[PDB]
Design a protein around this ligand. Structure first.
Ligand SMILES: NCCc1c[nH]c2ccc(O)cc12
Ligand SMILES: [Ca+2]
Length: 223
């Protein structure tokens, strides 16, 4: 997260870290046994880490649970990032509490202008690299579809939205991939892609979760 703030330990209780020997992606806990992330985060041998603040220190509220199954969306296109969403089933159910909690799925799509919270352990600089150990947070509005398509001509599908600031300076970045965009207590987006981080006229692009609610629910009910 570039230009954000330190969230505070366990203030984003649905945030997960995906670990394959090291943190490589975020995700969101949607019930005691399922995580939603980006399909571009797919790999084998994932351990899901819940209750994390400092990802390099055991602080006492972590639950580490291996993934039993990963399901990339059937229509994911890795070249366009259309349908950039994946579900991960945990080998066992997490223990839910005040610091480990699920985030609800939306019943309706959010409109441009809605303020949302984006969080992750990604790079904090727009040039060069500095990766934080503690969770970073960013408040950003959803942008109009016309401003999003004007920023990325020919690249924005109906399954994507832009959020952030056209002036630059504040954005998600590398390592925030797969993480949540939460607006009014509902999961509306997944950190997906962009042109660099925090660049003028290049806001972050996010997977539009409201379009996938029926796929998520049907998949969870049968796996
Ligand atoms: N807005 C952050 C977009 C994003 C997701 N993954 C990334 C990886 C590298 C990068 O420069 C940018 C990204
Ligand atoms: Ca920790």
């Amino acid at each position: 997260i570039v230009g954000g703030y330190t969230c505070g330990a366990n203030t984003v209780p649905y945030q997960v870290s995906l670990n394959s020997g090291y943190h490589f992606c975020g995700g969101s806990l949607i019930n005691s046994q399922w995580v939603v992330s980006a399909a571009h985060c797919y790999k084998s041998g994932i351990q899901v880490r819940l209750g994390e603040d400092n990802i390099n220190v055991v602080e006492g509220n972590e639950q580490f649970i291996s993934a039993s199954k990963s399901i990339v969306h059937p229509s994911y296109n890795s070249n366009t990032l259309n349908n950039d969403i994946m579900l991960i089933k945990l080998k066992s159910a997490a223990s839910l509490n005040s610091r480990v909690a699920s985030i609800s799925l939306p019943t309706s799509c959010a409109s441009a202008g809605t303020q949302c919270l984006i969080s992750g352990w990604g790079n904090t600089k727009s040039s060069g690299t500095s990766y934080p150990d503690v969770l970073k947070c960013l408040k950003a509005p959803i942008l109009s579809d016309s401003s999003c398509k004007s920023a990325y001509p020919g690249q924005i599908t109906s399954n994507m939205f832009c959020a952030g600031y056209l002036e630059g300076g504040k954005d998600s970045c590398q390592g925030d991939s797969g993480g949540p965009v939460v607006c009014s207590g509902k999961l509306q987006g997944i950190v997906s892609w962009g042109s660099g981080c925090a660049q003028k006229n290049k806001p972050g692009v996010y997977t539009k979760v409201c379009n996938y609610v029926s796929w998520i629910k049907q998949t969870i009910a049968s796996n």
